[PDB]
């Protein structure tokens, strides 16, 4: 004869979603008290290693259904918007601009530099001043001598606060009590399907809110081989995450001691604008090691053939067209915003059986973040020196469409959906909830004593 028994504390979990706690390195806040991603307050990083290796436990993963990605995305946006909310209210700034090209320049006729002076308000309602502020061509449109800011018909143009750092700060996500985060330990995991070995950790680690478009930057590297990951292969609407197993170093710089002018346009209403430029002016650009790029692509090609066959040809091509953000590689360095021409990286065909590549870049000060409609941020100028060193860890690629008369396939840069960047770090983790009630058969009948 068997009876019902109750066991509190049973080690069983079910898939679940809960809001995760934000954790970060407090020291980052101490050095940059106004950093956007540096929480005024947070949970400690909890670097301590997993106590549990869950021996003989397997679990099913699906990175494409993992909602912790949405939580990361939502929080990054919310922090961004709040930190810039009170800064300046420059929307009244837009006035008719009247001007011609820069003359008596040293130069590199590039149409990039525009010397513009326009009527503007002062601290007193009754007085007016002339600003004489320079603009990049990308930020302005013609009404041909008359100009207007490109986003003037959007709700507002607001300057980012000069005190706020945009450097990415590591963010760790920690479980609420009663919940846990599981991590897949499988090598070369597809980020989906059954994981041969798992472990339990109190928090995620090493995740940074790095914003980029065509290339995946400063992310985690595959332990053994380059991985090709996608929601599907046959659906051309979906993006491919390349996941390098090695870094490719890229250097980017910008000329040349651009000065800054501080303008008051009302009571305490500071406005920063680009002043004169010292010395020559050269086009901004980035440098990619050519030799490194070969080894990198060769490995990608070998992996792609696993999905398409070994009698195939892998061709690369530059962008399909669309908005500047998807057609060019973009990044934030030094607080400055860049858009770069990556076509030099893709002019090749791969057939089965000290040099470098220079990529030209352009700078614009008005940015519409996350493809939001009607709103724009004006970046204040960075005073004269940009130097960047970065690790390319992958690309976001799409496969070309149509039927073929051959085994040739073509790949291009694509995506532009920032959530796919987050996936490159979050695919390893899963959130589950612990159930404390369990019932099992026994020989005991609970003899009553009284």
């Amino acid at each position: 004869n068997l009876w019902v028994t109750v066991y509190y504390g049973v080690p069983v979990w079910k898939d679940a979603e809960t809001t995760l706690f934000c954790a970060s390195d407090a020291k980052a806040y101490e050095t940059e008290k106004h950093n956007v991603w540096a929480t005024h307050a947070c949970v400690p990083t909890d670097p301590n290693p997993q106590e549990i290796h869950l021996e003989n436990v397997t679990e099913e993963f699906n990175m494409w259904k993992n909602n912790m990605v949405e939580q990361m995305h939502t929080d990054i946006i919310s922090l961004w918007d709040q930190s810039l909310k009170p800064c300046v209210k420059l929307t009244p700034l837009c006035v008719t601009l009247q001007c011609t090209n820069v003359t008596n320049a040293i130069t590199d006729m590039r149409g990039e530099l525009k010397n513009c002076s326009f009527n503007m308000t002062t601290e007193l309602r009754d007085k007016k001043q002339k600003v004489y502020s320079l603009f990049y061509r990308l930020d302005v449109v013609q009404i041909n001598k008359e100009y207007r800011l490109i986003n003037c018909n959007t709700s507002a143009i607001t300057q980012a606060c000069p005190k706020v750092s945009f450097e990415p700060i590591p963010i760790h996500y920690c479980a609420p009590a009663g919940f846990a985060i599981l991590k897949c330990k499988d090598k070369k995991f597809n980020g989906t399907g059954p994981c041969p070995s798992v472990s339990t950790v109190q928090c995620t680690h090493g995740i940074k809110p790095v914003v980029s478009t065509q290339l995946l930057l400063n992310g985690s590297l595959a332990e053994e081989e380059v991985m090709i990951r996608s929601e599907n292969i046959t659906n051309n609407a979906k993006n491919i995450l390349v996941q390098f197993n090695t870094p490719v170093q890229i250097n980017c710089t910008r000329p040349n001691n651009n000065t800054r002018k501080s303008i008051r346009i009302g009571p305490g209403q500071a406005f920063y604008a680009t002043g004169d430029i010292i010395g020559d002016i050269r086009q901004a650009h980035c440098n990619v090691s050519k030799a490194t790029w070969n080894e990198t692509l060769g490995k990608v090609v070998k992996q792609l053939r696993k999905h398409f066959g070994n009698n195939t040809i892998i061709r690369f091509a530059n962008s399909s067209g669309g908005d500047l953000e998807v057609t060019t590689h973009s990044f934030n360095c030094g607080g400055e915003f860049f858009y770069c021409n990556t076509s030099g990286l893709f002019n090749s065909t791969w057939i089965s059986n000290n040099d470098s590549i220079t990529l030209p870049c352009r700078i614009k000060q008005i940015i519409n973040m996350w493809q939001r409609i009607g709103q724009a941020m004006y970046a204040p100028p960075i005073q004269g020196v940009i130097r960047c060193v970065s690790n390319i860890t992958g690309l976001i690629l799409t496969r070309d469409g149509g039927s073929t008369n051959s085994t040739t396939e073509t790949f291009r840069p694509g995506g532009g959906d920032m959530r796919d960047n987050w996936r490159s770090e979050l695919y390893k983790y899963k959130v589950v909830k612990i159930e404390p009630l369990g019932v099992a058969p026994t020989r005991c009948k609970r003899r009553v004593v009284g």
Partner: antibody
Framework: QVQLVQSGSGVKKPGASVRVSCWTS?????????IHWVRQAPGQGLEWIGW?????????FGSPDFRQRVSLTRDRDLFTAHMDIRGLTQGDTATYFC????????????????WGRGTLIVVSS | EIVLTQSPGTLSLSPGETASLSCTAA????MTWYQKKPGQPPKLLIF???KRASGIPDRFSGSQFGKQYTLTITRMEPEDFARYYC?????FGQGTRLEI
């Protein structure tokens, strides 16, 4: 079963360019992930041409011939889309359609829930 | 090899009996179905999951095994006579026509 508003039909000379456009409500447009274009020549079955992503403007085409001769654009503030075709030939005479997909996940497959009435482009002497 | 093919092709019908159409394809994609009448835009009938589309008066259904999907049309009603097309992602079949 909401019909999309389709631009008018017409006739062009060979080598001429043509623009085809369509419009919808702001609610439909916002909900739409992809805008697709398809073509049907008289006596022929339906041929897929390509799509434009409503958010980023990214474009994906079928045959490379279309890639060279066709450009797709979209405008999120006007809730519209446009198709620009250049180098028209007599073989391009066909009905063209604007169509939309609101299915956001893998395993759902492709759908065209909404259609315009379509428009006829005639290319001749 | 044609990625997506459709059969039986044009066929004679008798109302009151239930019709069937089918298609086959390479690389195991999901199949969906559409129909059209001359002068009209096409209408969605069947989802990738075999779920009936909104606006469908409960006369359409289907299933698959392996690389082949078959749909049925209840009682061959004359209102449903149309050109029919099987779709898989970027590909369409040559289509069929319902006749009496």
């Amino acid at each position: 079963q909401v019909q999309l508003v389709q631009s008018g039909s017409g006739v062009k000379k060979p080598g001429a360019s043509v623009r085809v456009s369509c419009w919808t409500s702001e609610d439909i447009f916002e909900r739409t992930e992809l805008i697709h274009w398809v073509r049907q020549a008289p006596g022929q079955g339906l041929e897929w041409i390509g799509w434009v992503k409503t958010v980023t403007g990214a474009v994906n085409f079928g045959s490379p011939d279309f890639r060279q001769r066709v450009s797709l654009t979209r405008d999120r503030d006007l809730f519209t889309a446009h198709m620009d075709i250049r180098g028209l030939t007599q073989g391009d005479t066909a009905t063209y359609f604007c169509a939309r997909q609101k299915f956001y996940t893998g395993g759902q497959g492709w759908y065209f829930d909404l259609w315009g009435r379509g428009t006829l482009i005639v290319v001749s002497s | 090899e044609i990625v997506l093919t459709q059969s039986p092709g044009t066929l004679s019908l008798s109302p009151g009996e239930t019709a069937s159409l089918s298609c086959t394809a390479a690389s195991y994609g999901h199949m969906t179905w559409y129909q059209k009448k001359p002068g009209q835009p096409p209408k969605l009938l069947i989802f990738a999951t075999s779920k009936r589309a909104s606006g469908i008066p409960d006369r359409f259904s289907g299933s698959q095994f392996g690389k082949q999907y078959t749909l049925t049309i209840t009682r061959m009603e004359p209102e449903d006579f149309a050109r029919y097309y099987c779709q898989q992602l970027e590909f369409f079949g040559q289509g069929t026509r319902l006749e009496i």
